[PDB]
């Protein structure tokens, strides 16, 4: 333990050794029976600073117009449903005066809050996953083949997995058990997650902030997380109760910035 | 109470990472017999051909490690009809081509004798040429998944590979001639040091396919038994 | 010059030393570093967040979204068992492919005391209890629900709570215990048992579903790093 | 069971659009080289090492593939963009190399 | 002696290494330096004066001094394009000969900001205006004056001054951009726009020139060291 | 703002300088078949051999480095009938003659049996030879580029080769006598070190052509392309 | 470098020096010792305690 | 970055960095 330096570099040294809303712009959610909200890795979602910020250009922070509380569409929950999924900021690229910033804007920063909201009675049974995973690198159905991108995430359709594996020559593979990274879906409670129990919960509140190598990055070729709803305990009720039970998703931007201002995209 | 005892020193970051792992085996000849085992290989730096040490990185979304590079090259005499040949002892060269850089074309190509690309020399009998690089990226941090395109239209290569061009490794004999071939093996041994991991990732299952995306075969979630209570007195 | 002396282990190329080396490009400017959320600084802060095990991994359920699905239904006779399993993290292969066993083959011995954490994905109608139980090696296991009462055990209530931790005591000989377990290192047997029944008003399907996570308490630690045995390849990925 | 060609055995482009070409191969490979035949003249090289470059190729001339699947693909086809393209692979029990893509200019 | 081990490294001849070793000729009496002008201690410096940018090289004009010299003549309708390149310094065959372009291409990095600056050198009585725009990568091009108005832009009277400064500003995610450009690290496109017209009074020849030249603003730094892919030989020169 | 960074260390003139550039490829033997590729061979040392460190060097008018001379020294043996010989090993010797001093006639003069010319003895086996040299010069610079000539009349010789003087390199084989021919490749390597670069010059366009003057052939100043506009939406 | 040179008994295993060495696998959290009773420090401490002699060793 | 000097000239120095 001499500690002793002869180089000159640092890359040369040696080892280191109720009514609780949420009023978002002109949008009221309601509510979280004083439950909880689980936020991101312990961070809150927070703008730029100057340590950051290679761009030279002024950001453009709307803060009303594109960080409102914006309804994605209605999915319906049954016995034999596998799953969901939506890639993020796709799925919001058509809504409102935030998909509007995205076309004029070649840089993109910012963080959401997803509501995931299933309502059910007390003689329903069942328990969904709401994970929201970073950079999820999904594998081809049929390999050493390339697959399209309107297969990993259309304009805000949720893509859903499947029960069996997918034998598709364009498309990724679906096996739900797989999660579509090749990984055990058990072990996805490492990413920002929150459970749906059926008997207690009715909702899950997720604050995921912006996670990324780069401080700004371009939003129309780089899918920053997706958000995958895994049912693990299947619906089940008695053939007199009310069969449909849907599943709506409402998500929100929080502190988005924008960076390159030019004509519209995204050729 | 008990009072308790055992330092999580072994658990650390530096200490999983930091083990001496071969990440590619480069073949390379004297006399030409075909390709490969053609004298003059190359290899661009990737650290995705070796299961081992694929999974290790491939738990953490984003790392800042350094590295130190090591060579095991070690050489055996091809089979002919005779062997009998004095020889003076084989020098080695394996130049870094920096992401851009002009490549050797051919053998005797005077990018051997170039003066900005790097190249260390070792003839056969000493210790193994070890050598560091820094943290060669232009974002802050590797990007060991990246979801998304490489073009803005979202179209040309899905997956990871638009963020790897760590450059490349060429290997070459410097001797002129052998009187009898000799066929060389030199081994890379990358060692991840002053590692920062960032986001964890849950460990991969099924055993990878191919060197460029994350393709995969479904595999059951564990193996299974006979019946689930367990049952003797 | 200084008079030296090679000592024995010179030009030597040990895989786990710790020297320095000459840099190959010099006074690098490297990027600055960025806050990126969720930093993690060591392997037991990914092993100590839960993750929900396989238990009903009977053939062919591995195959499916069933191996997360414990069973459970209305009884005729109470006292019977709804699940079981060795406590051989590792190498059992019921918890081995969690997030804690994952971690764990990575290492060739292991200590500290286990949390099991329990949810009943059940109706919110249905009222039952439960005798979740660990049971020291010694000899044997245990067959009747008056025999897995006389070791460490809890009572779980579904019509109370719907989560219950189960913190599973250390208790052994050894500092440590074997990751890829021998007789000598034996750890126990969990299981659990039906106190009472699963009493449901009518209009209410019968069977229901117990979730099972596994984590690592604070007192966890592990030892003699190694190499996986999971992955297997023989030429290199093209 | 046993040969090895391009796929598209005759093409056809009008100068301005994308020539993508596709090699079969029965073995894999690593390296694939692609030539530039021209008719009655000695054919010349094209792309080595499946990417790389040659002597008098322009820039546009791109080309990746690897395994039994090969693709050289032109960017924009030019007055001097109409040849007959070959492959290769040097074995160890050669395969042996295709036939060579039959190109013409569209008018 | 003293008892030494030798690690790994030994015995090797990196070039890029730093070390001593004993002189040839000792006690050498070097002759004393002057105070020759004009001393250059770093490459960027080299990099920081301007050098004129060979815009208008269509064949063959780069074998003569017309490739210095961008046309401009009295419009018809306006909004017309004067000319356009890609901000590729370095790649792109317009700005790599020049003088900011042979000393990135000594490396394998770029980043900072880039000054573009023009030279009217056309009569004194002419007047008129242009929209030099600068446009972000993003998508696509800009193909009307329409469309590259609502990027960076400035507008240049010739009446006023003959010499406009547009200081491109450094807009990118990542850190550095990579000289052999790539798909991924892209820079965006730079285009020149009639904003009103090439107005004279009679007796003035119609067809003017425009001189443009590059240099690199303060902000300017590179990385990586490489050779250049310029100069190429097989033997020795003799 | 934003607050910036990315220092200018790599840009200097000792980090663009400092790197172990080739200048000239020895070859010599130990049975002499012909000239070349006889023993013995020399070299006046001259910096514009390679146009690699050559460019580097006329980018600035005036020089005043240091030096670092390396050689890596590597050999084959010759084709013949047979190879089978035991062999002890091969001692090489570098000798520099310093401007004017005596020359070694043939192989087995007594020059190499000096007491004033530096020489550097290696066995083939160990680490490269490594030595340094001062600033050799009579003025205060090295003039890479002398514009005029060398006799007052403004005759004779035309360019920077009357300011270059600075010596010769002799290579040979210390052995007598091996069993059957050897043929020896020295390869220097110079380094510039404590360099002072005065007046900056522009960077050369066309590939030179010979090791004595600038002559040239002309060439256009870039690579053309279709149109001066460029279009799509 | 720092210019060295070899001392005569350099490359040799002497099975009774006493040198250091790389170790294998480190940063290792062995075990704590307990207190184990009956402790013995040295080799003559075995030799003054009694052992009773076979005087009458006469065949067989 | 130890920075001793074993010999006595300055042209035996390291680079100046």
């Known amino acids: 333990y001499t500690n002793i330096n002869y180089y000159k570099d640092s890359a040369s040294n040696s080892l280191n050794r109720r009514v609780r809303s949420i009023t978002l712009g002109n949008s009221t959610i309601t509510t979280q029976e004083c439950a909880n909200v689980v936020v991101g890795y312990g961070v809150w979602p927070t703008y730029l600073s100057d340590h950051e910020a290679t761009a030279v250009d002024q950001p453009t922070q709307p803060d009303v117009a594109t960080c409102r509380f914006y309804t994605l569409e209605s999915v319906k929950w049954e016995s034999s449903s596998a799953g969901w999924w939506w890639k993020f900021p796709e799925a919001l690229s058509d809504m409102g005066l935030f998909g509007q910033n995205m076309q004029y804007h070649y840089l993109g920063r910012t963080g959401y809050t997803i509501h995931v909201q299933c309502n059910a009675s007390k003689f329903h049974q069942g328990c969904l996953l709401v994970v929201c995973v970073p950079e999820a690198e999904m594998g081809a159905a049929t390999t050493d083949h390339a697959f399209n991108h309107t297969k990993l995430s259309n304009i805000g359709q949720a893509m859903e997995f499947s029960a069996k594996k997918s034998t598709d020559q364009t498309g990724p593979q679906t096996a739900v058990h797989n999660a579509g990274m090749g990984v055990a879906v058990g072990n996805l409670t490492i990413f920002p997650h929150q459970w749906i129990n059926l008997r207690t919960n009715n909702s899950a509140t997720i604050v995921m902030p912006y996670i990324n190598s780069v401080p700004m990055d371009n939003m129309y070729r780089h899918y920053n997380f997706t958000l995958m709803v895994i049912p693990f305990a299947k619906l089940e009720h008695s053939p007199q109760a009310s069969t449909y039970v849907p599943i709506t998703v409402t998500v929100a931007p929080m502190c988005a910035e924008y960076n390159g201002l030019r004509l519209a995209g995204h050729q | ?233 | ?238 | ?107």
Not at chain 2, 134 to 160: E, K, L, R, T
Not at chain 3, 107 to 126: P, V
Not at chain 3, 158 to 183: E, K, M
Not at chain 4, 74 to 86: F, K, L, R, V
Request: hydrophobic residues 35%; contains cysteine.
């Open chain 4, 1 to 107: 069971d046993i040969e090895l060609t391009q796929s598209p055995a005759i093409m056809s482009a009008s100068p301005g659009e994308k020539v993508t070409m596709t090699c079969s191969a029965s073995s894999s490979l690593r390296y694939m080289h692609w030539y530039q035949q021209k008719s009655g003249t000695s054919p010349k090289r094209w792309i080595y090492d499946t990417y790389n470059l040659a002597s008098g190729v322009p820039v546009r001339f791109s080309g990746s593939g690897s395994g039994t699947s090969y693709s050289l693909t032109i960017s924009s086809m030019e007055a001097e963009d109409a040849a007959t393209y070959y492959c290769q692979q040097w074995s160890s029990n050669p395969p042996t190399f295709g036939a060579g893509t039959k190109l013409e200019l569209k008018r």
């Open chain 2, 1 to 233: 109470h008990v009072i308790n005892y055992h330092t999580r020193s072994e658990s650390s970051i530096e200490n999983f990472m930091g083990r001496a792992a071969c990440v590619y085996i480069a073949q390379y000849a004297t006399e030409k017999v075909n390709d490969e085992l053609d004298r003059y290989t190359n290899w661009e730096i990737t650290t995705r051909q070796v299961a081992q040490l694929r999974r290790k990185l491939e738990m953490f979304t984003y790392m800042r490690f350094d590295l130190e590079i090591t060579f095991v090259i070690t050489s055996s005499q091809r089979t002919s009809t005779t062997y009998a040949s004095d020889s003076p002892p084989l020098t080695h060269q394996v130049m870094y081509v920096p992401p851009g850089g002009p490549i050797p074309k051919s053998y005797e190509d005077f990018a051997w004798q170039t003066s900005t690309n790097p190249s260390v020399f070792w003839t056969e009998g000493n210790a193994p040429p070890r050598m560091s690089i820094p943290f060669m990226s232009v974002g802050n941090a590797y990007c060991n998944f990246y979801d998304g395109w490489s073009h803005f239209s979202q179209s040309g290569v899905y997956g990871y590979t638009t963020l790897n061009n760590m450059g490349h490794l060429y290997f070459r004999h410097v001797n002129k001639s052998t009187a009898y071939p000799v066929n060389s093996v030199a081994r890379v041994y990358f060692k991840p040091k002053h590692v920062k991991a960032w986001v964890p990732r849950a460990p991969r299952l099924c055993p990878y396919l191919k060197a460029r995306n994350v393709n995969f075969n479904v595999q059951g979630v564990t193996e299974s038994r006979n019946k689930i209570t367990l049952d003797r007195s």
């Open chain 3, 1 to 238: 010059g200084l008079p030296t002396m090679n000592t024995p282990g010179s030009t030597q190329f040990l895989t786990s030393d710790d020297f320095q080396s000459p840099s190959a490009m010099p006074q690098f400017d490297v990027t600055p570093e960025i806050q990126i959320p969720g930093q993690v600084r060591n392997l037991m802060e990914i092993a100590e967040v839960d993750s929900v095990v396989p238990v009903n991994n009977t053939e062919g359920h591995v195959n499916s979204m069933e191996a997360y699905r414990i069973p459970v239904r209305p009884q005729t006779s109470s006292g019977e068992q709804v699940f079981g399993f060795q406590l051989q993290p590792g190498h059992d292969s019921v918890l081995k492919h969690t997030l804690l066993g994952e971690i764990l083959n990575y290492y060739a011995n292991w200590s500290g005391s286990m949390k099991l954490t329990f949810m009943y994905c059940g109706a919110a109608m249905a009222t039952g209890k439960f005798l979740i139980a660990y049971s020291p090696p010694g000899a044997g296991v245990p067959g009747s629900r008056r025999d897995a009462m006389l070791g460490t055990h809890v009572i779980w209530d579904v019509g109370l709570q719907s989560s219950c931790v189960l913190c599973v005591p250390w208790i052994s000989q050894t500092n440590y215990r074997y990751v890829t377990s021998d007789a000598y290192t034996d750890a126990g047997y969990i299981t659990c048992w039906y106190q009472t029944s699963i009493v449901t008003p009518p209009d209410i399907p019968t069977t229901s579903t117990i979730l099972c996570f596994v984590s690592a308490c604070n007192d966890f630690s592990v030892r003699l790093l190694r190499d996986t045995p999971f992955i297997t390849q023989q030429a290199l990925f093209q």
